[PDB]
Write a protein that binds this ligand. Structure first.
Ligand code: A1EG7
Length: 412
């Protein structure tokens, strides 16, 4: 029994990191690409947005029909397609072609997320799902940190083409391995399935009218959209306007991801500690106080980065701002998942998470072409100023709505 749970969870952890590294490989190798194939700021945006659009369509549709699909096949198939797209991209040299391959990568990526959830419920008792989900989430943060550094070093003699085209062969091999290892159900290998686990079931039309659902959703679009702006365009702001080199720009990229690793873990640990001292009720959520502090740090940290950082600034001051931003950015994302689960009606628990995910990727879309267009017209600094203002305004609005009703659905 135990031997099987370790092999599976490790395997899913391994697979998830590779989907992500491959989703972002484009951002990792962007400075080099621009130098070899010269491109305008706007062109870069179109390629980034195209992936975000596909992912959103795929992730919403997939979840709805996932109850009809097998996890072992779905995870493996998705990985193979992502890998093949990466190989082709390196060979290709023109922008219209690059964008279409990126859309295809986005759609394949969608296939991966629903299976992970199904195995987790099936092999682990419902009580522990929360802990496992968070450990699994850390896979992304590890991959994201390792990659930028690897690129700024591997590009010493190798081409951008050959450093993206191994991230395809490795994907194919690991897809085969994960097809071999993952098992859909405990009954498949001979072990007994886990023991299976009618009070005012709200109708779907009553869910969409809940005031707290939108405050929790639009508050997730702003945080996620801002995190994508600094993840993709933060490197060119230092390279072009701040007079920094490419190595320093990629060093800031890794320190951003490392900060979130200690941020997601601390957010879960700190949240329930405060929850046990007050308790839960219909009006308000005790984790609001912790969420406001993390959001406050995010807007303050970005303000110092735009103004204080310059060519004279030492390397240490650049990294510390990135690390603090990573802690303050990834922290709300972990809390938003927990808050949605408890507030959601028991009968519509699954649909509530899907709705939040839909508006999640819309924020990523706005961080692509619309953000790049503002930067090209005036400057990179002008575009980042707009992102700072939007984040600050959201915190004040969410502050005033801290005492609204949270339990979605008709409450007697
Ligand atoms: O599904 C969940 C969270 C469940 C959860 C948490 C704590 C628990 O204790 C628990 O029992 C259950 O969150 C969703 C995760 C999301 O799909 C992702 O990042 O991949 C984005 C968005 O869709 C979120 O809503």
């Amino acid at each position: 029994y135990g031997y099987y749970r370790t092999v599976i969870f490790s395997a899913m952890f391994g697979g998830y990191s590779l989907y992500y590294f491959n989703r972002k490989t484009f951002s990792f190798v962007m400075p080099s690409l621009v130098e070899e194939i010269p491109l305008d700021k706007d062109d870069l945006g179109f390629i980034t947005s195209s992936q975000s659009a596909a992912y959103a369509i795929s992730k919403f549709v997939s979840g709805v029909l996932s109850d009809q699909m097998s996890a072992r096949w779905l995870f493996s198939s998705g990985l193979l397609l992502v890998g093949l797209v990466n190989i082709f991209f390196a060979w290709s040299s023109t922008v219209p072609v690059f964008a279409a391959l990126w859309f295809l990568n986005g759609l394949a990526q969608g296939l991966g997320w629903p299976p992970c959830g199904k195995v987790l419920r099936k092999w682990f008792e419902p009580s522990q799902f929360g802990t496992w989900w968070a450990i699994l989430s850390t896979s992304m943060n590890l991959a994201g940190g390792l990659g930028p550094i690897l690129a700024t070093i591997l590009a010493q003699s190798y081409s951008w083409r050959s450093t993206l085209a191994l991230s395809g062969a490795l994907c194919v091999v690991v897809s085969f391995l994960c097809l071999l290892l993952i098992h859909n159900e405990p009954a498949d290998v001979g072990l007994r399935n886990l023991d299976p686990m009618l009070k005012e079931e709200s109708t779907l039309q009553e869910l969409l009218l809940s005031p707290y659902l939108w405050v929790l959703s639009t508050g997730y679009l702003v945080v996620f959209g801002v995190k994508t702006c600094c993840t993709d365009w933060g490197q060119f702001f230092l390279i072009q306007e701040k007079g920094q080199s490419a190595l320093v720009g990629s060093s800031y990229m890794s320190a951003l991801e490392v900060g979130g690793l200690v941020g997601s873990i601390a957010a879960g640990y700190l949240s329930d500690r405060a929850m046990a001292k007050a308790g839960l009720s219909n009006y308000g959520n005790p984790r609001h106080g912790l969420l406001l502090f993390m959001m406050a740090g995010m807007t303050v940290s970005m303000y110092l980065f735009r103004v204080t950082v310059t060519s004279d600034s030492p390397k240490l001051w650049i990294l510390v701002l990135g690390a603090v931003f990573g802690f303050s950015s990834y922290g709300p994302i972990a809390l938003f998942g927990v808050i949605a689960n408890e507030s959601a009606p028991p009968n519509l628990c699954g649909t509530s998470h899907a709705i939040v995910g839909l508006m999640a990727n819309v924020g990523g879309f706005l961080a692509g072409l619309p953000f790049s267009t503002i930067a090209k017209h005036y400057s990179w600094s002008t575009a980042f100023w707009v992102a700072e203002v939007i984040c600050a305004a959201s915190t004040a609005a969410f502050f005033l709505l801290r005492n609204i009703r949270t339990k979605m659905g008709r409450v007697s």
